[PDB]
Ligand binder design. Sequence first.
Ligand SMILES: [K+]
Ligand SMILES: [K+]
Ligand SMILES: [K+]
Ligand SMILES: [K+]
Ligand SMILES: [K+]
Ligand SMILES: [K+]
Ligand SMILES: [K+]
Ligand SMILES: [Mg+2]
Ligand SMILES: [Mg+2]
Ligand SMILES: [Mg+2]
Ligand SMILES: [Mg+2]
Ligand SMILES: [Mg+2]
Ligand SMILES: [Mg+2]
Ligand SMILES: [Mg+2]
Ligand SMILES: [Mg+2]
Ligand SMILES: [Mg+2]
Ligand SMILES: [Mg+2]
Ligand SMILES: [Mg+2]
Ligand SMILES: [Mg+2]
Ligand SMILES: [Mg+2]
Ligand SMILES: [Mg+2]
Ligand SMILES: [Mg+2]
Ligand SMILES: [Mg+2]
Ligand SMILES: [Mg+2]
Lengths: 101, 300, 75, 88, 131, 92, 31, 151, 59
Amino acid sequence: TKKIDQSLSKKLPKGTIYDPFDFSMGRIHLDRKYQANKNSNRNDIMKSGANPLEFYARPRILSRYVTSTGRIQHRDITGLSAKNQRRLSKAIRRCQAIGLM
Amino acid sequence: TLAELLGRSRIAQVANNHKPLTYTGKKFHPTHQIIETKPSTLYRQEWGLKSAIPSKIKSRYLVYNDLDTLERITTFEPRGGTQWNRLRFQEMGVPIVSNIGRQNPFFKYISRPEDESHAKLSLFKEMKGDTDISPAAMKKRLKKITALIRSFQDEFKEWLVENHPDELKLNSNKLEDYVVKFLNKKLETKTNKKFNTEIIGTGGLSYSLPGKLKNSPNGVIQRTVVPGRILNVVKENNDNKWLAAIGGFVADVVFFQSPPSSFNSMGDFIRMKTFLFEILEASMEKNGSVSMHARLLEPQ
Amino acid sequence: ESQLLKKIDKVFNDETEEFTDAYDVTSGNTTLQTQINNAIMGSLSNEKFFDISLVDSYLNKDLKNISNKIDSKLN
Amino acid sequence: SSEVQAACMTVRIQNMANHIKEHRKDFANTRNLRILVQQRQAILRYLKRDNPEKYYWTIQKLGLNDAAITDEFNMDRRYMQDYEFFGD
Amino acid sequence: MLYELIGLVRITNSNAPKLEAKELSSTIGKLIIQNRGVVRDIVPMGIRYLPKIMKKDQEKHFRAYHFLMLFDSSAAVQSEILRTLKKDPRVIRSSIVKVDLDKQLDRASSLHRSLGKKSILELVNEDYQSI
Amino acid sequence: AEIARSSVENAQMRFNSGKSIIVNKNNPAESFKRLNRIMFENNIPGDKRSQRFYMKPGKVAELKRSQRHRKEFMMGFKRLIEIVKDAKRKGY
Amino acid sequence: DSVMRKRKKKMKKHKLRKRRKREKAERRKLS
Amino acid sequence: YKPKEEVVKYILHGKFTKNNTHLTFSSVVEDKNFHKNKGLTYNDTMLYYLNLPQKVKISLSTGCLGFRKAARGEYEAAFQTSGRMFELIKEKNMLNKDIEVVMDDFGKGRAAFISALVGKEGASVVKKVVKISDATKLKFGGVRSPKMRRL
Amino acid sequence: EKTTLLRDIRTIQDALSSGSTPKELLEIKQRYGIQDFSQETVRQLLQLDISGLEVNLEK
RNA sequence: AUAAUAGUAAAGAUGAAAUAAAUAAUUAUAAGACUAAUAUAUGUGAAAAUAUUAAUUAAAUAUUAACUGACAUUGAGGGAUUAAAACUAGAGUAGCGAAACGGAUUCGAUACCCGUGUAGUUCUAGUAGUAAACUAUGAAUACAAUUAUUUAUAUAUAUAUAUAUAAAUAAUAAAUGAAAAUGAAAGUAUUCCACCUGAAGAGUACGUUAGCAAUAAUGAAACUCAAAACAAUAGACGG
Ligand SMILES: [K+]
Ligand SMILES: [K+]
Ligand SMILES: [K+]
Ligand SMILES: [K+]
Ligand SMILES: [K+]
Ligand SMILES: [K+]
Ligand SMILES: [K+]
Ligand SMILES: [Mg+2]
Ligand SMILES: [Mg+2]
Ligand SMILES: [Mg+2]
Ligand SMILES: [Mg+2]
Ligand SMILES: [Mg+2]
Ligand SMILES: [Mg+2]
Ligand SMILES: [Mg+2]
Ligand SMILES: [Mg+2]
Ligand SMILES: [Mg+2]
Ligand SMILES: [Mg+2]
Ligand SMILES: [Mg+2]
Ligand SMILES: [Mg+2]
Ligand SMILES: [Mg+2]
Ligand SMILES: [Mg+2]
Ligand SMILES: [Mg+2]
Ligand SMILES: [Mg+2]
Ligand SMILES: [Mg+2]
């Protein structure tokens, strides 16, 4: 067979430097273990400094912090500060009461 | 005094670094200072750090973050492999060239205001170059600056009525120009980001000047041939070039006309074989990466 | 009521655009440039939305004692 | 100055009393009102000791009398009934 | 006090989707300006599908015209507006939230503040100085 | 009319509940596995069982406190095991 | 005091409550 | 103008409780002339097509297959009841249009029904099933449940 | 008095720029006491106390 | 719960059972109570309490500036508030559920489990002032060695971290302690209040006060005994 699963091969980006270890399975496993959604902050409005309570009439943004059934995600999952989690949950509950979410 | 000596000590010479020792993102340049110990000191676990490195370590190169921690260990990784990437680049003898034809950053050139005609582009870059700034510390750039700029109102309420009164009575299209120049002229004396942290040129990867020819017993070398590896068996998606792994760098390989038949045959194991490449040019991007362009020299 | 009828027509008109919040539309500086100009120029500013400097210079005989000064210089 | 503090407290007492008359079950704010009235008594008691002339002038202008200041006051249920705080 | 009304009007006629919304905004706006109030802005939000099928006055709805109305009035007038909205068969859902004016007199609608435009002056100055 | 006929597809799926899967005609047992994952990530089976019998508020509060402690305790345990493994790798 | 000791007070309270219920009943018939 | 009742899809509903399993097969009937009626608004038309009427065709419990008392709520009772349903759907020529499966609760018959439909017993019905969903009814507060049993 | 400051200050600035002297001005010379209608009389009708405070503070 | 619809013959319950055109499914209508995720009761509140949304009114934070000039602390008596249950009126009554009447279990079963389910649980206006009303730890002030983690304010810049000062929490030094342990107090000190003086009798009796009432507060003595209690230790035992 001339095919390998993507999970068993690492694609080295262009312009990056590499070591021989980057072709091993240890690199594959190490990349899975340390795979965190750290790029969310730059794409996370609520981790930017905006007040989540100003989005109570924008269900599309709020729908990014609820599960498929509408259950607000725990702070352990959203990664927000206590204040933003508190404000975001209020926004979602207000949005639900208005008839938008 | 002891404080003076400490400031000049070899440990002080290493700049503070808390960057992750285990980083799984894109690596474009070295992030940690390589520490080396001599064989005699390695035999005694001596590295010039606070504590002895565990005897299990057989490498003579490491990178560290903290001399000591609350866990009573040193935070270190026994690797020094970014030095071999630099030395392999030196062996390829390809000077780094500017794709924009800019002045050489390692020479003290006499520059002029040719690019200074964008005073309003960069004077406001100080407040507009805030891509990743706090929502309130960036807002402190609005009141703190406003007061500083508002303290020059009297100076600009007299200079403008003494050097360009016509514009004040005709149009503000030129007044705005006199404003951008005024602040810069009154800011060049100031020190706003007087130290620039941007990478300077190659960043230290190569100090080789373009122009020199490589003499060899078989005559002057006209094309540099370097062994490499093809990573993918299908060109980079959306790009007309494949990717190769040459000397610790990932390059874009351009083929003469066709792709060798070993590609289809090998498939996803194409990286298992070594091909010969020719390094066309090497460029440096602002992210601090090296843009190496190669050519898959095939036996013919 | 006259202003109300004009506003309703101008906002609920087919030509008018409505905030449907279906996509992250793309494009601060504008409002930051008006501030910078009103801080440096002050009374002698060209911004439509000026600061209290202009109203202060008026009641302090500055915008008038400078207009005459400039005109006298032109003479 | 104690006279100014008493006057400033008087304004808040008048406002808070109006609130209580419309929210007779708001015990949290009734407690706040009681404490504020007792605070005003305390400041005026000091004023009587410090500057008696100002003291008598101040209480006359505020509509109070010496008894209202010196006597122990708890704003209890009997007070609400003897002065018809809530009306009927 | 500054208030922000968000109303979900019924779209009875598919040919005139923005008809009851215009008639309703005029009714609400007239109440505000005839009782010492000021209407600061009227931001239409367009036809949107309701998150579920909703009911009102023995009728069912699956879509509504969304509109926002930022207005200044007294508390008594604000309650009168809310009472009229809760009774009008056209209105499916209505919410009035106070916008604090303690720190600044000119606040934009939450929709605009969410986009970084904190005051109506910032919105107007971006339509004159740059448009 | 046809306007109410050609706009029913989105409308039908616009009022989704989030507890539905489009079956993969090839592997139909993989779609039931996906649905089960939704149930567990929204705690549907747990909530249903917890709603069968009434629990006093004090008991509810006790159980919520203990569960949180065990969750946090496990996170602290894993952090210490990671340090152990890292320390072992470096020869400590 | 421990549960063991609390149980002695519990028994005394139960017997007092039992006696007062008994007395109440009598008053009802005798009334 | 004329009743034109037609089947659009079938709903296979399963209620899996602790003591029994109920399986209902239904048809989503659509009068294809509803839009041809007079005095019909765009809202009424869209509201009629968003909740189409349903007609029950097959109704089964575990007691219809002879399982009695405590055996009704077991895995084997559900597996056989699921088979009988998948058979009655083929014996009634109701395997022409797409089927939507709706599961309600998490008793012991929920995993038996799934096994009987992804296996040999449901190799004909599974080919028509287009959408699976869960319809477990939860309460946000709501009525007070009975007291905990002391056993 | 339906007359408003803005309107009155718009007549003292139009009459002073057009030459018209309707009796309204004489009345306006009594409503405000401004007998003389010049550009340096409207500036003294619209003076704000804040301006005086700003100079006392500098002293 | 009621009605409609097709569709049927069992359904429901339990350890297993049995007591009382259905169950299930899709619609429509009505009613009462409750408040899923977020969530940590984090935080807030004097305590009791407090987490679906909005509004009105009231109260609540930090720093700075100015001001008052010891105006403070504590607090007998007193006052106010005070879970659940309970009671007095008028409404409400879906679900739950003392009692009662039945079904089971058992040698018996005035129980644990099941059914029917009254008071009650709900709202309005009141009475009453009790809980393991608990941190089983009164309030205030001065002070003492560290670390970690959050939070807040401030400062800086080569702009995102760094440096400061407080608060909270966790683990500790010292100290204290019968020990378990406490840890900024259960430490070093000062001030004020409440309370205790062997067990049992007893928070009982009698009287008194208060309450529509249940009761609440106050609160003994005789007789009898040489006991009685706490922390910790080693065992034995544990369905
Ligand atoms: K708390
Ligand atoms: K003094
Ligand atoms: K005292
Ligand atoms: K007392
Ligand atoms: K009831
Ligand atoms: K407790
Ligand atoms: K005390
Ligand atoms: Mg006091
Ligand atoms: Mg004790
Ligand atoms: Mg069973
Ligand atoms: Mg029951
Ligand atoms: Mg039914
Ligand atoms: Mg909740
Ligand atoms: Mg707490
Ligand atoms: Mg006190
Ligand atoms: Mg009653
Ligand atoms: Mg019972
Ligand atoms: Mg009471
Ligand atoms: Mg008692
Ligand atoms: Mg007590
Ligand atoms: Mg309690
Ligand atoms: Mg105090
Ligand atoms: Mg008693
Ligand atoms: Mg013990």
